[PDB]
Design a protein around this ligand. Sequence first.
Ligand code: CLA
Ligand code: CLA
Ligand SMILES: CC(/C=C/C=C(C)/C=C/[C@@]12O[C@]1(C)C[C@@H](O)CC2(C)C)=C\C=C\C=C(C)\C=C\C=C(C)\C=C\[C@@]12O[C@]1(C)C[C@@H](O)CC2(C)C
Ligand SMILES: CC1=C(/C=C/C(C)=C/C=C/C(C)=C\C=C\C=C(C)\C=C\C=C(C)\C=C\C2=C(C)CCCC2(C)C)C(C)(C)CCC1
Ligand code: SF4
Ligand code: SF4
Lengths: 80, 69, 208, 154, 206, 43
Amino acid sequence: SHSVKIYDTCIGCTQCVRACPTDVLEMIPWDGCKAKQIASAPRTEDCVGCKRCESACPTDFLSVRVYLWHETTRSMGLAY
Amino acid sequence: KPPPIGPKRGSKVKILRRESYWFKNVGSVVAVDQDPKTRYPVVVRFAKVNYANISTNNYALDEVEEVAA
Amino acid sequence: VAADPDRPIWFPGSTPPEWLDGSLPGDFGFDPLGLSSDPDSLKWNVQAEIVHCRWAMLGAAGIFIPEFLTKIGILNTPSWYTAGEQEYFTDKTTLFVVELILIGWAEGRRWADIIKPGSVNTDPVFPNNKLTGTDVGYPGGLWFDPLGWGSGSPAKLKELRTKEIKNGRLAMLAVMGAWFQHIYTGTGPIDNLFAHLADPGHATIFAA
Amino acid sequence: DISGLTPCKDSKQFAKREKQQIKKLESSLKLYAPESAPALALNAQIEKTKRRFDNYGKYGLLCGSDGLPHLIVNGDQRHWGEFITPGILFLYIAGWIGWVGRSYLIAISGEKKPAMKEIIIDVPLASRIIFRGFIWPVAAYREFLNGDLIAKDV
Amino acid sequence: RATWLPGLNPPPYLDGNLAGDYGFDPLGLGEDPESLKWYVQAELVHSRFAMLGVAGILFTDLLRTTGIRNLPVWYEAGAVKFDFASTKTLIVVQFLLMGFAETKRYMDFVSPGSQAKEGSFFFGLEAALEGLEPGYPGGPLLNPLGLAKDVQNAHDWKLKEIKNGRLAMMAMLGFFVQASVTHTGPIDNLVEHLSNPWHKTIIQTL
Amino acid sequence: MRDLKTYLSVAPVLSTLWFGSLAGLLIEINRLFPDALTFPFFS
Ligand code: CLA
Ligand code: CLA
Ligand SMILES: CC(/C=C/C=C(C)/C=C/[C@@]12O[C@]1(C)C[C@@H](O)CC2(C)C)=C\C=C\C=C(C)\C=C\C=C(C)\C=C\[C@@]12O[C@]1(C)C[C@@H](O)CC2(C)C
Ligand SMILES: CC1=C(/C=C/C(C)=C/C=C/C(C)=C\C=C\C=C(C)\C=C\C=C(C)\C=C\C2=C(C)CCCC2(C)C)C(C)(C)CCC1
Ligand code: SF4
Ligand code: SF4
């Protein structure tokens, strides 16, 4: 559904996923920062698009980035 | 090199990054990650915050340029 | 400017404020609102009190002495309230401008003396002249202090300066009393005094 | 007499506006005694109206067919009191406002937290600057020549 | 020194070595140094023109009021139709000549060596325009007497100049306003003040 | 007090002081000089 992307300007603060209410994100090891971790987005099918991840990305503009795309029943957040 | 690679701690620096909030704005280098594998070591501290209420950001060496002052 | 921690205060039993150490000439600790909590605000309000006191003393004299030596020590003075309506050898707006130009000179020298403590002591025309005043608000010069009484021990000077502002405070009160009297009452101040001394009961502010 | 407009000192409908407003204020004047506060205030407003109309007559205002003063902005020397002299009077004050504000923001720019000086206005600083905009048409011109008016990008 | 009001330090961007300083710049106009230089030359020229103005008004009105010559009032003096020449010609001639004067002064201010070096022909006089100083040109054309040959060590002369000129400028503003609300000459207003000073001032104009 | 003057210098208190003074100025001008459409001095 939605296309979440994490760019290399990350600082590995783990606020994107700790804010993400649908388990879309997960921190993985990395070698590009002092924290040695970066966020990944495997479960984009569960992505609703609420952008709580990028409302908590403390960078110049953003590192995590949500692109609104094909909306399915779970990206639209429907219990019916 | 083990000696510093980037600007000095406190050197007021300009941002050449086009996507940053402080583009063509001065800054204040507070640290430079001397590890020769990180991509954006230059930790800058600006005076005015961005839209996310943040005054600091990491920048590269080529995405930065010190002023004549 | 020596402190007196156990001086008599305006309101005995009260604790006077910290910014009134007793140093000033006549500080009985009366500052409830805190209008002199700051040091510079206190230094300004001191000179404000001093000059309001001195102007009010000259005012009280020029009101009551022309009103005392008119009702009994017979002379001819129009009034103190309606003296601004009377006419003289100059237009009313003209001599106002003249006394403004002449008083603003001295008041600008005072402004300089307050901002810079010693700046205006040399006579700009005759620099050999001088005012030997170290204390702000008390210029020890010939034109102000020719008789040499504004010098000496700081304790005698302090008791003399509190004598000054003590006379001046009730001079202020007396002048605004004459104001409110000539407004509420029709006649002049000394006539009000005689009407009070005739019948202290049925002569007061109350008329109903 | 330009733009087909007759002057107000020799206009008929302007005097008619005068007479109509005066009769309107007099109709509201025959309901009180001629010495009380309402009648005195109405007579004062009447004299205000009459002097207003006569002043608009004597200044050479141009009153159209509707009988109201039509201001000329083109730049006619007779009608610089309409726009150009008060326009300069405006721009002098407006640039005063802008220049004292700009010099204030530049004054606090070298502060640790300048924004608190925009909330808590440093009245001594501004008051020392508040008269510095009296000379704005020359100080700003020099700041433009010296290069201090417009900032540089870096 | 004595800087124009005691109790205030002079601004640090002007002090001492300048023609009659006294430290009066409360509105920060001489804060920038080149601005101060331009304003110094402006002041000198303004004060000299104003001094010539006060002389040409006071002298003419001494001749007029006393009755030595039937010269016109300073207020109504521009519309005198001269027989040999017209004002329409005089404005153009003034434009030409004072342009050759003031543009030369300017090009010296921006480049002091100019007007004397090369191809600066003024009837072969390319030496009297040496300048020697900003605001104080010198030379046989401009100071024939040469009271102040030196100009840096002539602080007394330049101080006298600038003080008399500040006072002449203030007197010219006096002539401007005093004779726009009273519509007489300065000498008339003076003898009106020297008859009854306490009854003829600015504020005695109702 | 220093803090009372710090509060009096705050933007709304100083704004209402400034605009009350200004409004009194313009008000008294439009009472002393009412009904004004043209600047007649040197007109
Ligand atoms: C002209 C007014 C004036 C001013 C500026 C001062 C200033 C000062 N006095 Mg003085 N004083 C005055 C009049 C004044 N006094 C009078 C008239 C009295 C007798 C009633 C006193 C009695 C007095 C005592 C006993 C003491 C002082 C002290 C002081 C100092 C500290 C208090 C302060 O910050 O005052 C600042 C005062 C003002 C800014 C004036 C207040 C203005 C508000 C608007 C007043 C409004 C209410 C008022 C009651 C209405 C007046 C009506 C009137 C007709 C009765 C300061 C130097 C103390 C000190 O250190 O002594 C040296 C001290 O111990 N004063
Ligand atoms: C932007 C559009 C606009 C415009 C252009 C106007 C224009 C005007 N209105 Mg209207 N008005 C408007 C919007 C507008 N109004 C709105 C929105 C309302 C509803 C709130 C009103 C309600 C209204 C009423 C109810 C009245 C007006 C009036 C006026 C007149 C005011 C003249 C006056 O008293 O100024 C005189 C000048 C001043 C008050 C400014 C003085 C500035 C000080 C003195 C500083 C300047 C001196 C300084 C020291 C510099 C000098 C030079 C030197 C020292 C350098 C003028 C024609 C009045 C009028 O007479 O109508 C014709 C009137 O009765 N208006
Ligand atoms: C009353 C007065 C001041 C009163 C102040 C008080 C009570 C202050 C109280 C407080 O601040 C303190 C102390 C401490 C704070 O913590 C608390 C409060 C409570 C806030 C001043 C009068 C001040 C009065 C003055 C300065 C009077 C001057 C008079 C003159 C010059 C008269 C001249 C003439 O009378 C002649 C000579 C002849 C006539 O014909 C013409 C004229 C012109 C009328
Ligand atoms: C005459 C007239 C007219 C017209 C006019 C015109 C057309 C004009 C134009 C003009 C123009 C075309 C202009 C332009 C400009 C530009 C620019 C570019 C500018 C800039 C400026 C600046 C920058 C400034 C600033 C400042 C100041 C000085 C003030 C305050 C402060 C500040 C800082 C803001 C008419 C007829 C209608 C009417 C009458 C009048
Ligand atoms: S991209 Fe943002 S949320 Fe994700 S690890 Fe980096 S700083 Fe944390
Ligand atoms: S948009 Fe919402 S659901 Fe999608 S990754 Fe961001 S926080 Fe998670």
